[PDB]
Design brief:
part of a larger assembly, 3 chains, A alpha+beta (about 90), B mainly beta (about 270), C mainly alpha (about 45), A: alpha+beta, two-stranded antiparallel ribbon, globular, B: about 270 residues, mainly beta, OB fold (Dihydrolipoamide Acetyltransferase, E2P), 3 domains, 7-stranded antiparallel sheet, 4-stranded antiparallel sheet, about 0% helix, RNA-binding, Large ribosomal subunit protein bL34 (chain C)
Chain lengths: ~90, ~270, ~45
RNA sequence: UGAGUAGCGAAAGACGGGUGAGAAUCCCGUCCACCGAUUGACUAAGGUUUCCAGAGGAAGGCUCGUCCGCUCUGGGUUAGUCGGGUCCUAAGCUGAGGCCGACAGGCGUAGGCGAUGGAUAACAGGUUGAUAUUCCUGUACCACCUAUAAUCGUUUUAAUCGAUGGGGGGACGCAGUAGGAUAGGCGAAGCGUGCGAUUGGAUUGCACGUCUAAGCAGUAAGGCUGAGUAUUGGUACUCGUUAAGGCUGAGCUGUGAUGGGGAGAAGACAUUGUGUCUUCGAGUCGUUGAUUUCACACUGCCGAGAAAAGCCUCUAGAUAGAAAAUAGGUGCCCGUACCGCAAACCGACACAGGUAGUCAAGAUGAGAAUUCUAAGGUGAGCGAGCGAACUCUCGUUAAGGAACUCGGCAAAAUGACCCCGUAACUUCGGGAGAAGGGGUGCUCUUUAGGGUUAACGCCCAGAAGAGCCGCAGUGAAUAGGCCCAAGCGACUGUUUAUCAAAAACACAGGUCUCUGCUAAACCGUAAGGUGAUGUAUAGGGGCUGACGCCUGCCCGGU
RNA sequence: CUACCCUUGGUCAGGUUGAAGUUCAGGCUGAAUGGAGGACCGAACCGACUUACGUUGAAAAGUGAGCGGAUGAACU
């Protein structure tokens, strides 16, 4: 369930400047609440989580050659931690 | 009791109102009030079935007891009060055990006077007792038609009826309308006349005052179109143009009787209106 | 000049809209009629 | 085809520099102009990525385009306290059983759902290209859980808790008045700035003088004539009109929160080509006038002005044993970008239209009117010439002054403030701003009330004289033409969205008639409803239409 | 959209007039006080009377200048 709650990390410039602090950004399953996210991070990465914020993103319109559609909707979570650090690249 | 206004304005030129000198308290009793949302003459289908009922002032309902079934206990009168839902004033009484309720207020009622109901009560203004125990000739109000149901006759401001005679289990009585009728002798009634006798002398004065009371205007039938009303118009003004005036629904409306035949109360009506 | 059609999210979902159409027999007729035509949007 | 014709959708731009293949149209600078009870700043609906950065110039943009609300690529919305849900109910909608009905189905009881209302714990500063009461720093508050504990003592009782038990409360209209505070405005100015090159002055020009929730103290007035006893919300007694605060509530003020933050200032940068900031310094006064904010508090009136929960109390009754305090912990879901009186909403359009609420500076004034400005925003997505006829919008005009025309249609004229004067008629209120006259700037004396106030002084002068200037003194803008006599309708109101606003409709008043209550009347096949939680001083229908004086003859016909 | 209604909310710069009532004075009327009204004048706001313009419109009902109501049978 823990490997199914967290989907992948987000690597952008806003997320990197946040990682300058102790904040890490994830894309998570669109059905979970922030308590599940908090407990999943602690189990997978073996750290101590201080807080967690979440937000929802709508689907966007997009084209590929006269084919109008939508992207997937997504859920984003930002995890502040007290002790430890997550190794990424 | 009737105060006249000076003609400072054309609207207030002949207006009249009654001063509220009988009222002794201007705030109702919180425990006996209930909500009363308005219906503008519209039934459970949502359609308008009675004309000319509209949006007046907001009102609360005072719970009045027309039964008077607490017997053998005295009640002392506290105050006379205004009631928006009827033409008579009301009085708040307090029973010896501490209960309060409203009754319609009779003509010569005063604060502090004690009032009583039962079969052994005395013949004095305010008392309620069965018609069997009321001597002939008494003036009486708030009469029942089925024993224990509550008073239904003679409840307007200044209304009264008087007892005439006695049959086996019925009592003769003359109503304010002028008709004489038999009423079951097990039915209660209250002694006296209903107060606020000046109520019908008021001159309303302006169109807006009757709109404050929930009355919307009335359009005459002869200024409508033929598809709207039997008096639907011709060219210019026109006479009635028929053997008899009609209603908006095409039925004669001047002189024709509408009481239904074969009613059970036919045998109780001794003499009708004249 | 005020035009007809002043939009409103709640009014639209309550007058048209799936549950309202399903609450009567003649609304279920509409839904079946649009299914038979192959229409992409039902209410 | 009409034809290189009509149009290019309200308005002020000019020049220098830059970039580019290409510039009236893009970027930067200076000057000029327009709005400013708003073309400024917030919040809703509605829209749904239009938001930001880099790249682009085929189509869209009424011209151009290097630009863009357009195309490509990649990004952006963070909540225990903000608005909803895990709270409450209104209208209304649904409704287990139930009632009715060719079928389909209609109604309705308990109960549910349903805000536009009731309840409800967070503020100041910092920071990004794009979010912030959400992130960061500081300081708080509210629920819930477990430990550490004084008080806890049969669990009747006792502390405790306690009812689908009782009582209170929440809890309410409209108008007016006199106040208390505070916000904001204005003038001296306690410390900052700089001191002029066109004649002159320097006692002179310009400005700032801030700062939260929470916590502690006290407190301007407000309400209750208050405060005990015995008995069944009520009845008898004592101190009473004291209000002393006895009690209850109550705006606001002082401390600290904060030797902190920010700050008119640079005066400290090696630098962040010196910009920006490493860094180090600093002021928090007294006057005046004062709400449209903070009480339906108080007084008055008739048309007599929601509910339920949260909340406070007394209980039947129950149980070790529950109290505050300290220390730890825990705190979900949805929305959050951007436009938003509009180039993004409703109008087919980058459309002179329509779109709920909040904030509201200076001079002048009664004013949110008028003209010019502030804070802030904007220069309108075709231009350059020439100054033809004709059309539109605007100004002036000799002599005459309605001769025009269906008709003074349109225009002109009146207009603010102060003083004087005011008819017929009348329902005695009115008519009335009737008509008709006169005055107004600036300076100096004398007086001189409100006396601003300690006071002439603060300030309108409260007023009288004596002077000066012009064609003209409410020198601009804005601000009633009036009178006489007849129809019609008493009056305020209403009407043919989009050719008729009226003499038409309403109306207060009058009169006739039906209706004794499961009322008559009306909707419905019925059940069920309105009438009405009303009861002849009431309810339905017809005609007339304030008020005054009145309302004649005919009952053969229907 | 529009007509009527139901429940629950919101808005109306300023000036003017001076009803009941009350208090004194005179001898029933005079002065103070008071603050009524489908009252008056006039912005916001709501309307739509006259006129000019527009009529392959800026707009499939508008704009400019005057104009009616503006505490109420008000507007939203």
């Amino acid at each position: 369930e823990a490997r199914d709650i967290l989907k992948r990390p987000v690597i952008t410039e806003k997320s990197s400047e946040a990682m300058a602090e102790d904040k890490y950004t994830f894309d998570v399953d669109t059905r979970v609440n922030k308590t599940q996210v908090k407990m999943a991070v602690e189990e997978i990465f073996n750290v101590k989580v201080a807080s967690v914020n979440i937000m929802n993103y709508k689907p966007k319109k997009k084209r590929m050659g006269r084919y109008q559609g939508y992207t997937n909707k997504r859920r984003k979570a930002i995890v502040t931690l007290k002790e430890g650090s997550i190794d990424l690249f | 009791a009737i105060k006249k206004y000076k003609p400072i304005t054309n609207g207030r030129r002949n207006m009249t109102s009654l001063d509220f000198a009988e009222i002794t308290k201007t705030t109702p009793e919180k425990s006996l009030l209930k909500p009363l949302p308005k219906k503008a003459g519209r039934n459970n289908q949502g359609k308008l079935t009675v004309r000319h009922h509209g949006g007046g002032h907001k009102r609360q309902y005072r719970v009045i007891d027309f039964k008077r079934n607490k017997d053998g206990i005295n009640a002392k009168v506290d105050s006379i009060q205004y009631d928006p839902n009827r033409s008579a004033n009301i009085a708040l009484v307090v029973y010896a055990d501490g209960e309060k309720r409203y009754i319609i207020a009779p003509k010569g009622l005063e604060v502090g006077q004690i009032v009583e109901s039962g079969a052994e009560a005395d013949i004095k203004v305010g008392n309620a007792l069965p018609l069997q125990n009321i001597p002939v000739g008494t003036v009486v109000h708030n009469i029942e038609l089925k024993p224990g149901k509550g008073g239904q006759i003679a409840r307007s401001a200044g209304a009264s009826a008087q007892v005439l005679g006695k049959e086996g289990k019925y009592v003769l009585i003359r109503l304010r309308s002028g008709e004489v009728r038999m009423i079951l002798s097990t039915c209660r009634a209250t002694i006296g006349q209903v107060g606020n006798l000046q109520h019908e002398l008021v001159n309303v004065g302006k169109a807006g005052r009757s709109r404050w009371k929930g009355i919307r205007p009335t359009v005459r039938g002869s200024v409508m179109n033929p598809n709207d009303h039997p008096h639907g118009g011709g060219e210019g003004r026109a006479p009635i143009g028929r053997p008899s005036p009609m209603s908006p629904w095409g039925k004669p409306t001047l002189g024709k009787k509408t009481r239904r035949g074969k009613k059970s109360s036919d045998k109780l009506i001794v003499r009708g209106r004249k | 000049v005020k035009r007809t059609y002043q939009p409103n999210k709640r009014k639209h979902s309550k007058v048209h809209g799936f549950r309202k159409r399903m609450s009567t027999k003649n609304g279920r007729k509409v839904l079946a009629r649009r299914r038979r035509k192959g229409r992409k949007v039902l209410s």
